[PDB]
Design an enzyme around this catalytic site. Structure first.
Site, PDB file in Angstrom:
ATOM      1  N   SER A   1      20.878  69.711 -48.516  1.00 44.33           N
ATOM      2  CA  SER A   1      20.966  69.928 -47.048  1.00 44.33           C
ATOM      3  C   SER A   1      19.831  70.701 -46.449  1.00 44.33           C
ATOM      4  O   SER A   1      19.773  70.786 -45.262  1.00 44.33           O
ATOM      5  CB  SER A   1      22.313  70.523 -46.601  1.00 44.33           C
ATOM      6  OG  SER A   1      23.341  69.568 -46.887  1.00 44.33           O
TER       7      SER A   1
ATOM      8  N   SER B   1      26.384  71.998 -42.073  1.00 46.16           N
ATOM      9  CA  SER B   1      25.762  71.021 -42.944  1.00 46.16           C
ATOM     10  C   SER B   1      26.490  69.675 -42.887  1.00 46.16           C
ATOM     11  O   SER B   1      26.882  69.134 -43.919  1.00 46.16           O
ATOM     12  CB  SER B   1      25.737  71.523 -44.396  1.00 46.16           C
ATOM     13  OG  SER B   1      24.499  72.053 -44.735  1.00 46.16           O
TER      14      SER B   1
ATOM     15  N   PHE C   1      22.814  72.560 -51.347  1.00 47.07           N
ATOM     16  CA  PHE C   1      23.550  72.594 -52.599  1.00 47.07           C
ATOM     17  C   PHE C   1      23.696  71.143 -53.056  1.00 47.07           C
ATOM     18  O   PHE C   1      24.362  70.368 -52.379  1.00 47.07           O
ATOM     19  CB  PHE C   1      24.937  73.248 -52.347  1.00 47.07           C
ATOM     20  CG  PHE C   1      25.884  73.234 -53.538  1.00 47.07           C
ATOM     21  CD1 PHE C   1      25.426  73.398 -54.861  1.00 47.07           C
ATOM     22  CD2 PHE C   1      27.268  73.128 -53.316  1.00 47.07           C
ATOM     23  CE1 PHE C   1      26.325  73.416 -55.938  1.00 47.07           C
ATOM     24  CE2 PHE C   1      28.191  73.163 -54.378  1.00 47.07           C
ATOM     25  CZ  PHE C   1      27.737  73.297 -55.698  1.00 47.07           C
TER      26      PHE C   1
ATOM     27  N   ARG D   1      23.084  82.325 -53.771  1.00 49.85           N
ATOM     28  CA  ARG D   1      21.894  81.765 -53.122  1.00 49.85           C
ATOM     29  C   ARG D   1      21.529  82.558 -51.866  1.00 49.85           C
ATOM     30  O   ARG D   1      20.405  82.464 -51.383  1.00 49.85           O
ATOM     31  CB  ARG D   1      22.082  80.279 -52.744  1.00 49.85           C
ATOM     32  CG  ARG D   1      23.106  80.080 -51.594  1.00 49.85           C
ATOM     33  CD  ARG D   1      23.387  78.639 -51.332  1.00 49.85           C
ATOM     34  NE  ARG D   1      24.472  78.498 -50.385  1.00 49.85           N
ATOM     35  CZ  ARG D   1      24.950  77.342 -49.935  1.00 49.85           C
ATOM     36  NH1 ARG D   1      24.408  76.182 -50.322  1.00 49.85           N
ATOM     37  NH2 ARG D   1      25.976  77.353 -49.089  1.00 49.85           N
TER      38      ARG D   1
END
Lengths: 248, 246
Positions: free
Chosen positions: B49, B97, B190, B232
């Protein structure tokens, strides 16, 4: 806007703090506004630093402000506030409401061009007397909460007589809170403490992009004591929280 | 880009979590960047994404996305996450996303235009093999953290082959944190969990506009378990806090 209605139930947030003031809140999709006080919503006050919005746009349009990455350099000379004594971005200069930066912008714009833009923006009473650098703060310019939301709506829709690019730049400079569901764009103003019989004014104006809805807002209050200043965000924040708009 | 320098003081944030990954941080410009891992900084991975950034710009440039206030209406049909099952603005679709919104955009852009813009942007290996609506998720497209920061710097500077207007629109849609002294523009990615032996990748890329300075960042990590996903953001956030950026 399409309509306005008085909603006296927000008054609890004002009376809890013994504040005299007004909140105007408008839903974009319906074009409908609500306020706690229809009369005050139409009363015109010094914009103080909320004037930095049209000022920033005009500075960009006239080329006085070069682009969104312009750094306004501190010349080294002692300024009125500690927080202004530093290099500043557009967003930086907006947020610390750096009087000297925007005074210089307005000086460079000049009366003729400033008056032209203020007329085009239908911004307030459009009266710029008392000095090209002091009219918004201690001069003659006056604007209402209803006029603030109309102006901000035109800014949101890129409808002001300015390039789309320059309106976009100012809209991003005004971002003050980001969440996954909403973006808040906003600007404070504060004219000073005035007297007890002639108080100053404090403002908080802006808009919330909330999912696919947008809410335009303008708050002002009488202020005679700098200690009360945080109420200019806290009252309209509590109202917007209670409306399910932010918090979130 | 310019030069990339190893900064070993960042390793502790990775080892503390048993994470294989990379952080690339560049102050002012990509002329010199710092990283924990020189080899990994230029290793290329599925963008997932994070690809929504160029996709949004290309969508706007081609007129597939009409303007910044376009609403992407939900048709009432099942979408893979509940948070995508609603009308979304451009910022909304980016922030959640919303894969299927961007898939339809990609289809309308079409392969020829898509390829053209990825070339113009020097976006990774510029390989769009695998299906117009999924090449960034399961196809052949690969990009490194170094290339992410170069691309983001060009966007920041309005130097991409797109209108200044469309670059500003996308930049606003990327705002994720606003403070008095800084503005963070960022995007997550991801790819999935893959296997132990072939893990997925997770990303967090963007820039921080702090005082009169700007910092471009890109983070990626191997990931084979979804419970590790918050890392992340927390690893790079910790690094940037320790650098005094945020």
């Amino acid at each position: 806007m399409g309509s306005i209605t008085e909603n006296t139930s927000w008054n609890k947030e004002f009376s809890a703090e013994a504040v005299n003031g007004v909140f105007v809140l408008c839903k974009s999709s319906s074009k409908s506004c609500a306020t706690n006080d229809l009369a005050r919503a139409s009363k015109e006050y010094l914009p103080a630093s909320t004037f930095k919005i049209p000022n920033a746009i005009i500075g960009l349009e006239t080329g006085v402000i070069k682009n969104e990455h312009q750094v306004f350099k501190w010349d080294g000379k002692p300024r009125a506030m500690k927080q202004w004594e530093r290099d500043l971005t557009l967003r930086g200069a907006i947020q610390v409401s750096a009087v000297p930066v925007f005074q210089q912008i307005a000086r460079e714009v000049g009366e003729v061009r400033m008056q032209k833009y203020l007329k085009k923006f239908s911004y307030g009473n459009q009266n710029i007397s008392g000095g090209i650098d002091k009219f918004h703060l201690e001069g003659q310019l006056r604007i209402s909460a209803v006029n603030q939301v109309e102006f901000l709506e035109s800014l949101y829709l890129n409808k002001l007589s300015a390039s789309k690019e320059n309106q976009l730049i100012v809209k991003e400079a005004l971002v003050t809170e980001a969440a996954p569901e909403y973006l808040v764009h906003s600007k404070t103003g504060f004219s000073g403490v005035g007297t007890e019989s002639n108080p100053g004014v404090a403002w908080w104006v802006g808009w919330v992009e909330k999912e696919t809805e947008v809410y335009f807002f303008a708050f002002n209050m009488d202020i005679d004591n700098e200690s009360k200043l945080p109420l200019r965000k806290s009252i309209p924040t509590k109202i917007m929280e209670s409306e399910g708009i932010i918090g979130g």
